[PDB]
Amino acid sequence: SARRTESDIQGFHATPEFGGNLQKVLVDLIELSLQGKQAHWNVVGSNFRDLHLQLDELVDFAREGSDTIAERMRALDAVPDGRSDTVAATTTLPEFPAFERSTADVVDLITTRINATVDTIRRVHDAVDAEDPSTADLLHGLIDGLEKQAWLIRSENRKV
Amino acid sequence: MSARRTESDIQGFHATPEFGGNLQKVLVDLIELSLQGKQAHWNVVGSNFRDLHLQLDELVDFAREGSDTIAERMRALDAVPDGRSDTVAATTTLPEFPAFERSTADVVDLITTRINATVDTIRRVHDAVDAEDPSTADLLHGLIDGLEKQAWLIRSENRKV
Amino acid sequence: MSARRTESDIQGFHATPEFGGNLQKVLVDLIELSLQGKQAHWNVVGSNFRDLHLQLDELVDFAREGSDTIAERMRALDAVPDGRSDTVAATTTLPEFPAFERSTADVVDLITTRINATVDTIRRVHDAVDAEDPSTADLLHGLIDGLEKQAWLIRSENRKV
Amino acid sequence: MSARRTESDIQGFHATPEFGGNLQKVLVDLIELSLQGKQAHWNVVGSNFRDLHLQLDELVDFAREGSDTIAERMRALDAVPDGRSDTVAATTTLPEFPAFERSTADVVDLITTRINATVDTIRRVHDAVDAEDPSTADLLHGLIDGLEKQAWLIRSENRKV
Amino acid sequence: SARRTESDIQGFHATPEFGGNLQKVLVDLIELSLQGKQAHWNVVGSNFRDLHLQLDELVDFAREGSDTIAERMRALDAVPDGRSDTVAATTTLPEFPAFERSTADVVDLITTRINATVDTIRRVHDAVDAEDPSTADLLHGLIDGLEKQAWLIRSENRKV
Amino acid sequence: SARRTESDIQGFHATPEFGGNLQKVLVDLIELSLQGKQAHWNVVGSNFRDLHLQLDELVDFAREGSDTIAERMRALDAVPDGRSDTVAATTTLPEFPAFERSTADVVDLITTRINATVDTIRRVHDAVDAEDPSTADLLHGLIDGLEKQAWLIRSENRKV
Amino acid sequence: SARRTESDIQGFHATPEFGGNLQKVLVDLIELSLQGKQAHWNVVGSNFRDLHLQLDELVDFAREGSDTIAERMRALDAVPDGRSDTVAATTTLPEFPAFERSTADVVDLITTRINATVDTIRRVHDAVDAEDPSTADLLHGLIDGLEKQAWLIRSENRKV
Amino acid sequence: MSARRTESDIQGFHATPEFGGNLQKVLVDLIELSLQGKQAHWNVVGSNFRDLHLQLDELVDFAREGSDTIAERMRALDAVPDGRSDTVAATTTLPEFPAFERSTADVVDLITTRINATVDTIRRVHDAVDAEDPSTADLLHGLIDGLEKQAWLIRSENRKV
Amino acid sequence: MSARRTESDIQGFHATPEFGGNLQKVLVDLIELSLQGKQAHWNVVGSNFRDLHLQLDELVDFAREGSDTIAERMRALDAVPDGRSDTVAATTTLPEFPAFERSTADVVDLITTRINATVDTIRRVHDAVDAEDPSTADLLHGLIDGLEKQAWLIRSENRKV
Amino acid sequence: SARRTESDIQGFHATPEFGGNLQKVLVDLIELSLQGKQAHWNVVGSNFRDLHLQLDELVDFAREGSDTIAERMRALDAVPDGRSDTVAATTTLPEFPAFERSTADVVDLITTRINATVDTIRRVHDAVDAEDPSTADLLHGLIDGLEKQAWLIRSENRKV
Amino acid sequence: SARRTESDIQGFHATPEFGGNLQKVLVDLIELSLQGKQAHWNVVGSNFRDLHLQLDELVDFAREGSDTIAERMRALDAVPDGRSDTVAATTTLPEFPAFERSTADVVDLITTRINATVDTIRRVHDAVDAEDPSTADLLHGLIDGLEKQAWLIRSENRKV
Amino acid sequence: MSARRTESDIQGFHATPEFGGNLQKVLVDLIELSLQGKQAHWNVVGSNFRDLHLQLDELVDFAREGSDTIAERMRALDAVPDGRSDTVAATTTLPEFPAFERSTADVVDLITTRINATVDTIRRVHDAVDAEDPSTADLLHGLIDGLEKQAWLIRSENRKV
Ligand SMILES: [Cl-]
Ligand SMILES: [Cl-]
Ligand SMILES: [Cl-]
Ligand SMILES: [Cl-]
Ligand SMILES: [Fe+2]
Ligand SMILES: [Fe+2]
Ligand SMILES: [Fe+2]
Ligand SMILES: [Fe+2]
Ligand SMILES: [Fe+2]
Ligand SMILES: [Fe+2]
Ligand SMILES: [Fe+2]
Ligand SMILES: [Fe+2]
Ligand SMILES: [Fe+2]
Ligand SMILES: [Fe+2]
Ligand SMILES: [Fe+2]
Ligand SMILES: [Fe+2]
Ligand SMILES: [Mg+2]
Ligand SMILES: [Mg+2]
Ligand SMILES: [Mg+2]
Ligand SMILES: [Mg+2]
């Protein structure tokens, strides 16, 4: 037998900094989600359908992404905060307009916010990775996914 | 071509500035509910945590589908929705969801209360909506039935009999 | 927190003693129908037995979903349903389904008649329900549409033209 | 057998000669729309052809389900529908769909206009239908919501902002 | 060729007793179903959701169980009777209450009725088996299934 | 390298005759569809359910059949016309009645129209095949399918 | 400790007689399958559709049964024979008529075949159960399945 | 204006006694193939047993689907199929499958030549069928390259280097 | 009129210490079989590796589903199962599986005799179980012919001619 | 009686020429597949999404076609060659540009590739049909499938 | 040109040490699986159902993990040992109690087992990552998966 | 209060010419692997043909999914992939697959070393990629252990004892 004795083995808990870094990624993921739906509903113009559908896909990814980070925070004993007031006050994403926007302006607007969201993740990467690699892999999924969304969307307005 | 209309441009039903405002109120409260639902979903702890952790997600799925439905019903009727965080926070009627871990019992009351508030908004607005466009009044009936069932499924956890 | 309500306990819509009674009548007749549907499903014999053996099950599936919907709509509105056998038998309005094997033709008339009776109950009660809670009136519309289609799909078997 | 009805033959709700006529108008326009939808689906060409080629099929699927629903709602209520080509052409209110290849832009206007006309018929008829049978008024609400969403999803392609 | 001659080969038909034994199992299966839905709708209290869902599963099993016995009776030339009046008058299950019941009382109430339903099946087992083994296997499915439901539900109120 | 030089390789385009032959098959497929739904809704009498369901299957086949021919016409540069007025004026199918019809009369009525629809396809077969075999295979699917529908339906009224 | 120390541990071997009894079951299941498809093809007349469909369901159950019985023989190292000649020379089922048959006749003809098939299983039951009870459970499923099928089909001609 | 035929009773395509006899030829070998395929499926034993056991069942499904298509194609064209065990044994052209357990290598060889035998039948009947009804030939094409693909998947087990 | 029992607390069927001990015997060998099956699944190497790799997993699924059914059947009958690794190793009757890579031929032989060992256990316990509770025996029947079918599918790889 | 008495009955063997004609088809199908993915990746500009998706559908049909043609050759004992070098050295399709290309250009470039691919099949049709009509049916599916794909894509640039 | 000219190109081989570290992971994953089912069976008391279900989910993730780790060892030519004796003699997890345990105790007991299981993976992480980073990604999934499972279960007893 | 960035045009992550060149290296070998995998899939012949035929297709799916992920990952990062047949043939590092039919044993050896060759490429590029973008390395990790698992499933067919 190589069995341990301990009857109260605890789990890995994150430092205050780690939790704060994930909280930063959470509010931006939620803000991207909210802006994503906004764009999804108010976009109009050439190739409306394509963008209308792609935006919902980006939202699906953002929502499952935010849930993953939030639950990951819970796992490491951190407490996430995704309430509306908190998101609006702490998000680093540029405010999205409130009215109808042409497909061309939606492509640029959202592409910018996806990138803003990816910059947050790339900014906290090295710190969350140094403390917990396993969490860094989740961020890699977010980065790859979001950046792929950016590509799919931005390509609509490309030169040649 | 006997009964055929010769019109070349027949526009559809446009919603009034009042009707749109009434769906906007519904929209924002459905979104607040969804945000508070996820928050509760994440931070709830204590006795029968799993049952509530799972029920809260179903609540959110319904609220999310509800908000998409209403918002698109606005677009259909030529209205323009606003589901941005700043707006939701500044215009929602739902009392703020507390922060941190809350026990299962508290989460049952907090969420039950906020679901009723949301249904409240829909009920208050119903008559004005129905009298203008019955079709949208049906979308509201679906949201009322779905939400109350949700509140029942949740509040029952704390019933003492 | 500008538009946010400060209430800590906002209760939901409660159904009246009359409203609940009106859904209870619907509940019991949907259950009788389901029990008579299975009975017919089992004991029907004769020409085109399969078609009716199968249609009767679809009828039962719809009645069962209907009864669950109404009963839960009562719970949602703070009412308490009674779908026990003793109660159903003693309070249903549907004429008793005969015993033993009944031919396809007879089963078509017997079941058609009992489906209409069930819809009857729903129609009689509709106005009182609608005037109090339109949302539930929609649940009834679904049951009326579904049930009449059912009766049509069944009664057509015996039409002579 | 206390509450049980002794009736041996209880007939169901029969629709009036007016009600049936009002659903027939809806039926034929839903069919014209479906035929024009396929025609557009086939002959549309130009910028963003795929998006519209696909959206048009969803439009047709909805119109087809709509027409089947209404026609069967007539059968249920003892009415007899007529969805034959001669009748549809001779009694539809939708302006004729042009022939040959039409660009994406034109197809967006042509189809948007014809969807509104179809919804028109449903709206004009709604009050008469509702006052007689609310249950069928709900089927119409579904068709109105579905169709307007359809028109929005389509017309947005040509919006300039 | 080893082919039979007979142009009117009949099937196995049950004796009056056999049919009566299956009829006994049928009315109790239907009564359990009705009581199951009743509990499913009116239960309240701690762990409401778990019980609310488990009860629907027990009903699903009871309904498909009653249909199996009824159709099996039809196969052997017996005529089942599952009408409301018959069920209420012939069922051996203890009446279930009509109002809201705490989860703790629902666990005990229903556990008792499932057992009552299983006792009926165990009571007619040896007789239906002696006459037709194939039918006994259907009863074994009912017994195993129902008793498994009893276990899943009753465990909620266990000591330690 | 065996690579071609041409930067503007065109596709196979049909002659006016070919397109006209497919147009003939299209309007009859659509008319069968419309008549199919009509029968589906207004049929009554013995074995109503069986016919009610079979007719919807025949319609499903006719609709996907009409879409195939129409899109095939588009592929070869032809322009289909399936508008109501055109169908009613060019179809060769005998008008279907407007009221309730007994199942026995629906079987005969529709069987006749399916055959009428198959005769059109068999009539243009050799010409479309001589010009484009690949299109003839689509017609073979229609023929096999439709004729199978005819069999399934007509069998209801058979002698012995 | 409780581990057995031999290296080749054999399983349960079926006696040649046991294999023979299963062979009698297999052969009738296969014959019934073949006859069912024949009826499925040539059935004709009133309520054609229902029968045409029920017969296919009967064949599916029969085909599944024969594969189950054949493999059960293999499991116990017996060797099945499902070849056309053996089936025609040893099946106990009455030959099936050769042309189009009305729905009324088909119902009567098939019910008899099913009963004859169920009969062989019942005749062989006890000898099988005495050697291997587990195999008897399979026979039980066939009996319940087949007899149910007999009920669904024979009912078309029941007059009460 | 009007291209509609008058005619009350339009006739379907009827196969000639010769045509029917050719399909009966294909049908009978397909069924035999299926019987022999299950036989092999059960008694195959040896190196790479599983792959063979599984592939044989996939062969039987195809032959079964094929025989049903052929038998019904005869029916649609007013011909009468005969798939009874006696007929199949007395008229099939396939060499009969051996009686007991067979090694994987022998099963591959055996089944491979019985498939070749089956498609050979279809090829022998191809031209006569095609001439009278090309639509039936397409079905033949399907069986042919569907069965030859199977022959390849099974026979390749024994091919060397 | 009334056949209802009065009794507040009707009791469930309780297995005897002997019965429970027999199922614990079946449980323990099933689990061991599963462990050994995954071992073989991972380390099998050689001619026809894939077929073996795959079939072994299908064997493990069955043994896992089987052990869960047996363990829960004990629970339902008030018995307490023990599937801990220590217990399984100290009480299983199956000869242990060798330590490293094993050729396909040896895996077939090895696993085949361990399955035979497992069902042998079930057969040894069959009669005693059947006598006390035939419903539990049916489950035994299922494991028996389910495991023997597996033994056939795997062992046949090594059988010659 | 009707049973054939030889033991090795061979199937239909493809002539070396037949194999060569199919080889010409395979190679262009594979080239088209490779080019389609290249366009799928680098396509860029207005209505990016639709094209990006349609191109994948085109590749799926192409990949399925090449596997069908390659295996049809195997079935008839011919031996396919789908290796990169052979495909590049014998494909008849024009080379595909190397960088990002606009949606307008991609539509034109792909339509040409598809037509060239359909062309080879049409050129080889008769020689194939003369030897094995069944294989010609496969070619027909490719032609209908590919030409349909050409229609869906070329329409993006149609101006009327 | 860029093609490599040797014929047997070997892949990455795992060192005996690397294999040993994965072996430590496998053994605890398997032990946890076995303990999870044991709890799944004997858990009893308040909120029985939720736990009973969550424990099964925990076992599924564990079983999938052990098969992933065992095969990852094979991929790199290491040889796993998941036999009962080896698992009992080398697992580092505390033994699991032998009888019925309350839901409260089970939650505490399992959380500890999961943490101990996650612990071994974390202890072995760096040594594994240094040799094969790709394998470290698998370890990361286990850590995120297992720790999430620990969170979902431990929360039942959290008091705040 | 406000953490929102102002900036109208926030930029995305751009790969370096070096990084892009490394992924182009992985892409080109993945595609070649796929081409060679289908080749083997079609021409493999001999003992245990089926298992190989099937596993090879499963290898091709993975390599195809892999090349698409790599090519798009380049696109997302502003790099331009080249998967044309000419490029692949001129730059792939995999030894080319032989021309005709190949025995199962030789296919196992052949494909096994070409997979090793492919992952070797990915491993050679791993560190440089990881340093510039770890998120792209995770994708590499996926291809690596996904391809090595395949190498194991195929190569094990030839391993002895
Ligand atoms: Cl799309
Ligand atoms: Cl749950
Ligand atoms: Cl049916
Ligand atoms: Cl396989
Ligand atoms: Fe979640
Ligand atoms: Fe939406
Ligand atoms: Fe419910
Ligand atoms: Fe319909
Ligand atoms: Fe039933
Ligand atoms: Fe289409
Ligand atoms: Fe089988
Ligand atoms: Fe069939
Ligand atoms: Fe379990
Ligand atoms: Fe393939
Ligand atoms: Fe595995
Ligand atoms: Fe892609
Ligand atoms: Mg719970
Ligand atoms: Mg019928
Ligand atoms: Mg588009
Ligand atoms: Mg194999």
DSSP per residue, L16-70: -HHHHHHHHHHHHHHHHHHHHHHHHHHHEESTTHHHHHHHHHHHHHHHHHHHHHH
Smallest Cα distance from I75 to chain G, Å: 23
Which tokens sit at E25? 């199992």
Please tell me if residue G45 touches chain E, with a CB cutoff of 8 Å.
no
Contacts of G1 in chain I (CB under 8 A): 90-91
Measured CA to CA, the distance from residue F91 to residue F113 in angstroms comes to 11
The position carrying tokens 């697959």 is L97
Which subunits sit against E, judged by 3+ Cβ pairs under 8 A? B, C, G, I, K
Q: Which residue has the tokens 């394509």?
A: A50
Judged by CB atoms closer than 8 Å, whether chains meet at K147 and A7 is answered as no
Q: Is I145 annotated as a binding residue?
A: no
Contact assessment for residue D15 and residue D74, using Cβ atoms and an 8 Å cutoff: yes
Neighbours of L50 (CB within 10 A): 22
CB neighbour list of residue G126: distance below 8 Å, 6 or more residues apart = none
Q: Is D53 annotated as a binding residue?
A: no
* Phi, psi (degrees; rounded to nearest 5) at A44: -150, 160
User: And the tokens for L32?
Assistant: 């070649």
Say which ligand is closest to the CA of C48.
Answer: 18
Query: Which among A32, A42, A90 is positioned nearest to B82, based on CA atoms?
Result: A42
Q: Point out which residues pair with F157 in neighbouring strands.
A: none
DSSP 3-state of G101 = strand
Domain parsing of chain F, residue ranges: 5-160
| Residues of chain F positioned with their CB less than 8 A from the CB of C153 | 48-49, 52
For residue F34, the SS3 value is helix
Sign of CA dihedral A127, A128, A132, A134: negative
Cα(A44)–Cα(I68) distance, rounded to whole angstroms? 56
Please give the CATH topology (third level) of the domain spanning I6-161. Answer: Ferritin (1.20.1260)
Q: Among L47, L51, L160, select the one facing I50 at the smallest CB separation.
A: L51
Distance F65 CA to ligand 1 centre (A): 23
Distance, CA of E133 to CA of E119 (rounded, Å)? 19
Query: What is the distance between the alpha carbons of residues F143 and C124, in angstroms, rounded to a whole number?
Result: 53
- Subunits next to I (3 or more Cβ pairs <8 Å) are E, G, H, K, L
Sign of CA dihedral K18, K24, K27, K28: negative
Task: Give the G window 1-30 contacts with F, CB below 8 Å.
Answer: none
Q: Which two tokens stand for residue G32?
A: 């019934």
A contact residues 49-88, partner K, Cβ 8 Å cutoff: 71-72, 74-76
Count of CB pairs separated by less than 8 Å, B with K:
39
Tell whether residue I82 is among the known ligand binding residues.
no
C-alpha H53 – ligand 20 centre gap (Å):
10
G41 to H88: CB separation less than 8 angstroms, yes or no: no
SS (H, E, C) chain E: CCCCCCCCCCCCCCCHHHHHHHHHHHHHHHHHHHHHHHHHHHEECCCHHHHHHHHHHHHHHHHHHHHHHHHHHHHCCCCCCCCHHHHHHHCCCCCCCCCCEEHHHHHHHHHHHHHHHHHHHHHHHHHHHHHCHHHHHHHHHHHHHHHHHHHHHHHHHCCC
Measured between beta carbons, the chain B residues lying within 8 angstroms of E46 are 47-48, 157
Residue partners of L47: CB distance under 8 A and separation at least 6: H47, H48, H157, I47, L103, L104, L105
Q: Chain H contact for I152, CB < 8 A? A: no
3-state DSSP assignment of residue G44: strand
Write out chain J in H/E/C secondary structure: CCCCCCCCCCCCCCCHHHHHHHHHHHHHHHHHHHHHHHHHHHEECCCHHHHHHHHHHHHHHHHHHHHHHHHHHHHCCCCCCCCHHHHHHHCCCCCCCCCCEEHHHHHHHHHHHHHHHHHHHHHHHHHHHHHCHHHHHHHHHHHHHHHHHHHHHHHHHCCC
List the single residue in B with minimal CA-CA distance to A96: B84
Helix (H, G, I), strand (E, B) or coil at F44: strand
Asked whether residue D48 is marked as a ligand-binding residue, the answer is yes
**What chain L residue is nearest to A108 in terms of C-alpha separation?**
L9
Residue J117 and residue F6: Cα distance in Å, rounded?
13
Contact between J3 and H148 using a beta-carbon 8 Å cutoff: no
Residues of chain J with Cβ-Cβ distance to A56 below 8 Å are none
Residue C132: both structure tokens together: 């109090």
The 3-state DSSP class for residue C44 equals strand
Q: How far apart are CA G132 and CA I145, in angstroms?
A: 10
Nearest partner of A88 among F20, F129, B85, judged by Cα? B85
Resolution in A: 2.4
Tokens for E125, please give them. Answer: 């087992």
In whole angstroms, what is the distance from residue D153 CA to residue I72 CA? 54
For residue J46, how many other CB atoms are within 10 A of its CB?
Answer: 20
Counting Cβ atoms within 10 Å, is residue J13 exposed (0-12), middle (13-18) or buried (19+)? exposed
Nearest residue in chain K measured CA to CA from E149: K49
DSSP I54-66: HHHHHHHHHHHHH
Size of interface C-F (CB pairs under 8 A): 38
Q: Where are the beta strands (DSSP E) in G25-143?
A: 43-44, 101-102
Structure-token match 């194609």, residue found:
H73
Q: How far apart are CA L81 and CA I5, in angstroms?
A: 78
Q: What are residue C29's DSSP bridge partners?
A: none
CA B88 to chain centre: 12
Chain G residue closest in CA terms to E134 = G140
Over chain K, what HEC string results?
CCCCCCCCCCCCCCCHHHHHHHHHHHHHHHHHHHHHHHHHHHEECCCHHHHHHHHHHHHHHHHHHHHHHHHHHHHCCCCCCCCHHHHHHHCCCCCCCCCCEEHHHHHHHHHHHHHHHHHHHHHHHHHHHHHCHHHHHHHHHHHHHHHHHHHHHHHHHCCC
Please name the chains neighbouring B, where neighbouring means 3+ C-beta pairs under 8 angstroms: A, C, D, E, K
- H helix runs in C44-103, sequence order: 49-76, 85-91
- Using the Cβ of C47 and the Cβ atoms of chain F, whether some distance falls under 8 Å is answered with yes
Q: How far apart are CA E16 and CA E18, in angstroms?
A: 6
Q: How far is the alpha carbon of L3 from chain A, nearest alpha carbon, in Å?
A: 5
Q: Do G155 and C102 touch (CB under 8 A)?
A: no
Question: What token pair was written down for F125?
Answer: 């077969």
Name the residue with tokens 């039809």: E74
| J136 interaction partners in chain H (CB closer than 8 Å) | 141
Residue to test with chain F: of H1, H2, H4, H69, most F Cβ within 10 A = H4
L158 C-alpha vs ligand 4 centroid, how far in Å? 18
Quick one: how far is CA D142 from the chain centroid? 10
For ligand 16, the distance from its centroid to the CA atom of residue L73, given in whole angstroms, is 10
G144 touches chain H (CB under 8 A): no
Q: How many CB atoms lie within 10 A of CB B16?
A: 14
SS3 at position C73: helix
Q: What is the DSSP letter of F101?
A: E
Q: Chain I: residue nearest H104 by CA?
A: I161
Is B41 assigned to a binding site? yes
Helix (H) / strand (E) element for C23: namely helix C17-43
CA distance J8 to C82: 75
Q: At what angle do helices I17-43 and K48-75 cross, to 10 degrees?
A: 30
Distance F49 CA to ligand 8 centre (A): 11
Backbone angles phi, psi at I150, to 5 degrees: -65, -45
For ligand 11, the distance from its centroid to the CA atom of residue G68, given in whole angstroms, is: 7
Is I95–G11 a contact, with Cβ atoms under 8 angstroms apart? no
Task: Give residue J59's Cα distance to chain centre.
Answer: 9
Across the interface, whether the CB atoms of J125 and F137 are under 8 A apart is answered no
I115 Cα to the center of ligand 20, angstroms:
21
The 3-state secondary structure of chain D reads: CCCCCCCCCCCCCCCCHHHHHHHHHHHHHHHHHHHHHHHHHHHEECCCHHHHHHHHHHHHHHHHHHHHHHHHHHHHCCCCCCCCHHHHHHHCCCCCCCCCCEEHHHHHHHHHHHHHHHHHHHHHHHHHHHHHCHHHHHHHHHHHHHHHHHHHHHHHHHCCC
Under 8 Å between Cβ of E149 and E53 = no
Which residues of C are annotated as part of the binding site for Fe(3+)? 41, 57, 68, 72
Q: Which amino acid is at C18?
A: E
C-alpha dihedral, L13 to L16 to L19 to L23, nearest 10° = 70
G100 is in an annotated binding site: no
- Ligand closest to G51 (CA) is 18
CB pairs under 8 A between H and I: 37
User: Which of E91, E111, E119 is nearest residue I3 as measured by Cβ atoms?
Assistant: E91
Is B82's CB within 8 Å of A98's CB? yes
Taking contacts as CB-CB distances below 8 angstroms, the residues of chain H near I51 are 48-51
Interface membership of K38 toward I (CB under 8 Å): yes
With contacts defined as CB-CB under 8 Å, which chain A residues touch J48? Answer: 50, 152, 155-156, 158
Q: What is the CATH architecture of F5-160? A: Up-down Bundle (1.20)
Dump the DSSP string for L83-131.
--HHHHHHH--SPPPPSS-EEHHHHHHHHHHHHHHHHHHHHHHHHHHHH
Looking at residue H157, what DSSP letter applies?
T
Angstroms from H124 CA to nearest CA on chain F: 21
Strand partners, A151: none
> How many other C-beta atoms are found inside a 10 Å radius of the C-beta of residue G150?
23
Rounded CA separation K143/K139 (Å): 6
Q: Chains with ≥3 Cβ pairs under 8 A against D?
A: A, B, C, F, J
